[PDB]
Amino acid sequence: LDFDFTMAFQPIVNCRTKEIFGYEALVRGLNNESAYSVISRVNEDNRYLFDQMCRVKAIALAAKLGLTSKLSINFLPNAIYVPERCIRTTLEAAKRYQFPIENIMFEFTEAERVEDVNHIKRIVEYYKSLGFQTAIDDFGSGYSGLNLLADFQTNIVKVDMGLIRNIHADQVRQSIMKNCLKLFSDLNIQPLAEGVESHAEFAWLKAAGVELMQGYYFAKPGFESLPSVNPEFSEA
Amino acid sequence: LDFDFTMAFQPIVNCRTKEIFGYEALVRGLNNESAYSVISRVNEDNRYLFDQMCRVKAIALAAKLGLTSKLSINFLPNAIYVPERCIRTTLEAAKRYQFPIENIMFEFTEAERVEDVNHIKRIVEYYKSLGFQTAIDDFGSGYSGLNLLADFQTNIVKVDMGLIRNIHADQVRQSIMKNCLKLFSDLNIQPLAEGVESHAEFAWLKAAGVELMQGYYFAKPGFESLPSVNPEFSEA
Ligand SMILES: [Ca+2]
Ligand SMILES: [Ca+2]
Ligand SMILES: [Ca+2]
Ligand SMILES: [Ca+2]
Ligand SMILES: [Ca+2]
Ligand SMILES: [Ca+2]
Ligand SMILES: [Ca+2]
Ligand SMILES: [Ca+2]
């Protein structure tokens, strides 16, 4: 690579157990520059080296910081195509840093419109076969999440914050989430609400059956650190 | 334009009453060349002229052919149809051919990922205000349809054929459709199943509560004609 970078970490909370489920790793510059400032440097001649560097940096920092729950890693959209040769680097990093593979979750975001779902399906089912956890990252925004779910199911579906925002007072968003939550339960998929910013949102989601949540209400990302979570969701 | 073209029409069937709800207008070459063959010729400098031409030809043919139900027109992805309010050419065409605005439905497909929903929402609500019927064309494929429905609702949501293909055999697709149909009712949106190809699909969808359907099982598009619907579906 021509550049270097590091990671921030944002906690995912289990509101039913009031414990931390894990942390999502998010790229930052060496002086806490934005993720977009780093990702904008990636190109077709870069993507595979960068993707491997994100995974190894995330595992190594998580190890150094003493992470004992889940580590969630964003998978650079257009996949490594052949999940065989390229998965080696991740399995070796996990072994070398003694980070259990079943405590690593990969979050999947589509690059382009998914005409043939088999490719991304193949990668998700291969990762599951190795013991990784898997998630759909952007349900309710960007590309069609139902197009994905119709042909394969991840362990977790992360619901975009756009569907979450002000849900305690938005009847249309309440209907969407009530019916999507029933869908996820029918498919044996665990939902995770992203972008929770207020107690009012959290309380509605909790009453609606959501356990896993993420967002500034709980904690912002911590540069090269594991942020502690707002005690207010454990109180209230 | 440096090319010419015409329209085919494909019926939308109300499976409860067995009446034709309307027809979707689909671009064709003058010698029945494919829609892709025509649309491939559309570029940045002629998109607006091409869109207006599609509308006038569809209205003129539907009138010439004696259409008395709904005419459904595909709205060319509007990331460049930013300005809008060039709709007098549509209104004038309808009046010339004595075709009510209320019997014209526009089907909306996104041009790219919808980060700011206000642009596409602005167009749909303006068309509703003029009296047009509106539909989300590609729910369950392409770009996120839930992203749209969270912020505005059309009269109809068309469900992509990928979600209904062999739905009588596919428990995952069954759960997706059962929960989406409940969502559509909560939003007061009428569902329409696209791409029905077999009696088994039709019968499952009819039992699930879908009334409006479209697909080869009923009738293929008809070049400059209003096709008749399959007698087998009427009885069976
Ligand atoms: Ca994402
Ligand atoms: Ca993510
Ligand atoms: Ca996400
Ligand atoms: Ca998506
Ligand atoms: Ca379309
Ligand atoms: Ca259409
Ligand atoms: Ca469609
Ligand atoms: Ca779509």
Side-chain angles (χ1 to χ4, degrees):
Chain A
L1 287 178
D2 303 72
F3 60 98
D4 200 6
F5 55 99
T6 185
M7 293 286 163
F9 295 96
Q10 186 178 28
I12 306 166
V13 307
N14 191 316
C15 302
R16 179 167 129 277
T17 67
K18 301 183 190 61
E19 274 150 16
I20 288 176
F21 168 88
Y23 293 75
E24 182 182 10
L26 301 160
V27 293
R28 295 292 182 271
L30 280 335
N31 283 255
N32 204 12
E33 294 87 337
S34 77
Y36 188 84
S37 74
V38 183
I39 284 169
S40 56
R41 302 167 164 271
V42 189
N43 49 70
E44 183 181 5
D45 315 324
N46 249 334
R47 273 137 196 176
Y48 304 103
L49 183 53
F50 174 76
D51 184 52
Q52 298 313 305
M53 287 309 304
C54 287
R55 296 172 184 209
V56 175
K57 287 176 182 292
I59 292 165
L61 247 185
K64 175 186 152 201
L65 294 166
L67 177 59
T68 63
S69 57
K70 248 78 157 158
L71 170 67
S72 202
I73 299 164
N74 291 280
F75 188 168
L76 198 60
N78 206 323
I80 28 64
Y81 270 89
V82 191
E84 322 311 334
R85 218 290 174 274
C86 305
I87 199 50
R88 222 189 102 184
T89 290
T90 299
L91 296 185
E92 287 174 353
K95 290 197 178 188
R96 294 183 176 152
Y97 289 94
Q98 305 175 2
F99 204 97
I101 278 80
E102 64 257 46
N103 283 3
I104 297 176
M105 178 164 69
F106 282 93
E107 310 187 358
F108 286 84
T109 295
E110 312 93 303
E112 51 200 339
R113 285 188 280 90
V114 181
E115 322 180 49
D116 166 72
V117 78
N118 269 26
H119 189 209
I120 186 173
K121 174 181 183 192
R122 278 194 299 276
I123 286 120
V124 170
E125 300 193 323
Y126 180 77
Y127 278 27
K128 294 237 226 89
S129 78
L130 297 186
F132 293 112
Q133 306 298 301
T134 58
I136 295 185
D137 196 358
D138 303 335
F139 187 88
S141 73
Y143 299 97
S144 170
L146 294 169
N147 183 44
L148 302 184
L149 288 179
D151 282 305
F152 65 87
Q153 295 80 54
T154 50
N155 305 97
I156 284 168
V157 169
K158 305 188 83 186
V159 179
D160 183 77
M161 72 176 175
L163 296 189
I164 271 5
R165 180 70 56 246
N166 288 334
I167 191 157
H168 59 284
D170 184 327
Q171 192 180 23
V172 167
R173 281 170 168 85
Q174 290 169 9
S175 290
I176 290 170
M177 273 293 105
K178 290 278 181 185
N179 289 291
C180 287
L181 291 174
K182 181 46 163 65
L183 204 218
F184 298 152
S185 176
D186 290 350
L187 300 183
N188 194 25
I189 301 173
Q190 174 164 229
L192 186 167
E194 300 182 320
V196 178
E197 290 184 350
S198 68
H199 184 263
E201 291 164 351
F202 148 79
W204 188 96
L205 293 162
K206 180 184 184 172
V210 184
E211 301 173 338
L212 303 186
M213 304 189 205
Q214 198 181 337
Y216 291 174
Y217 174 70
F218 304 102
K220 299 177 187 57
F223 178 84
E224 296 196 326
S225 65
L226 305 175
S228 178
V229 172
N230 175 26
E232 212 254 289
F233 95 111
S234 55
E235 319 280 77
Chain B
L1 300 173
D2 84 301
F3 59 93
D4 208 10
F5 58 96
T6 187
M7 292 290 156
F9 297 92
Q10 184 180 33
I12 298 165
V13 178
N14 184 310
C15 292
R16 202 192 77 246
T17 65
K18 300 178 190 173
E19 299 169 357
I20 292 175
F21 165 87
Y23 292 80
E24 179 180 10
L26 298 161
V27 124
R28 294 295 182 269
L30 289 184
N31 295 259
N32 201 24
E33 294 92 336
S34 64
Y36 172 81
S37 189
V38 177
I39 289 166
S40 305
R41 313 174 186 254
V42 184
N43 53 31
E44 297 211 315
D45 317 313
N46 66 18
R47 269 170 316 193
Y48 307 100
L49 211 175
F50 170 76
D51 189 60
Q52 303 195 126
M53 279 264 280
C54 282
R55 294 178 183 203
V56 174
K57 291 173 175 293
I59 294 169
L61 256 175
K64 165 190 173 298
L65 294 168
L67 183 56
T68 59
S69 64
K70 298 268 177 60
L71 174 64
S72 195
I73 301 166
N74 289 281
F75 194 155
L76 183 80
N78 339 16
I80 46 87
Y81 201 97
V82 175
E84 171 253 24
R85 246 93 167 193
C86 249
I87 199 179
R88 283 231 296 270
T89 44
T90 299
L91 307 175
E92 294 180 335
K95 174 62 236 295
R96 173 167 63 173
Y97 295 106
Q98 308 164 349
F99 203 97
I101 295 299
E102 29 284 310
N103 289 2
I104 297 171
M105 180 163 73
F106 280 100
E107 309 186 358
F108 284 85
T109 302
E110 313 92 311
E112 78 255 294
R113 302 161 74 184
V114 184
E115 297 180 353
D116 187 357
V117 79
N118 273 346
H119 190 285
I120 186 120
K121 174 180 166 68
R122 235 168 300 186
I123 303 164
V124 173
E125 292 183 351
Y126 175 65
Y127 280 29
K128 291 186 143 204
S129 70
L130 295 188
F132 292 106
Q133 292 289 301
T134 65
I136 294 177
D137 196 353
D138 303 343
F139 188 88
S141 66
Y143 300 106
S144 172
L146 287 179
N147 189 29
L148 299 182
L149 292 180
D151 287 314
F152 65 95
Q153 296 78 50
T154 46
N155 300 107
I156 283 172
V157 168
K158 299 232 280 184
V159 179
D160 182 76
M161 67 178 209
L163 290 189
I164 65 100
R165 183 64 58 240
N166 294 319
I167 189 164
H168 62 293
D170 188 333
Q171 187 271 349
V172 168
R173 282 177 165 73
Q174 292 171 7
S175 290
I176 292 178
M177 180 75 18
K178 174 196 179 182
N179 290 292
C180 287
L181 290 169
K182 302 169 77 62
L183 171 56
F184 297 149
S185 184
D186 290 355
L187 302 201
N188 200 17
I189 294 171
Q190 183 164 30
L192 192 164
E194 299 184 318
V196 177
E197 290 188 354
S198 64
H199 176 268
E201 288 165 356
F202 146 85
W204 193 95
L205 292 163
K206 185 175 174 283
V210 179
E211 297 200 355
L212 303 182
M213 298 191 208
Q214 183 178 354
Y216 289 172
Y217 178 66
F218 303 100
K220 305 172 190 176
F223 181 78
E224 298 194 319
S225 60
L226 302 179
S228 59
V229 164
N230 185 14
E232 190 265 297
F233 122 91
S234 309
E235 320 299 322

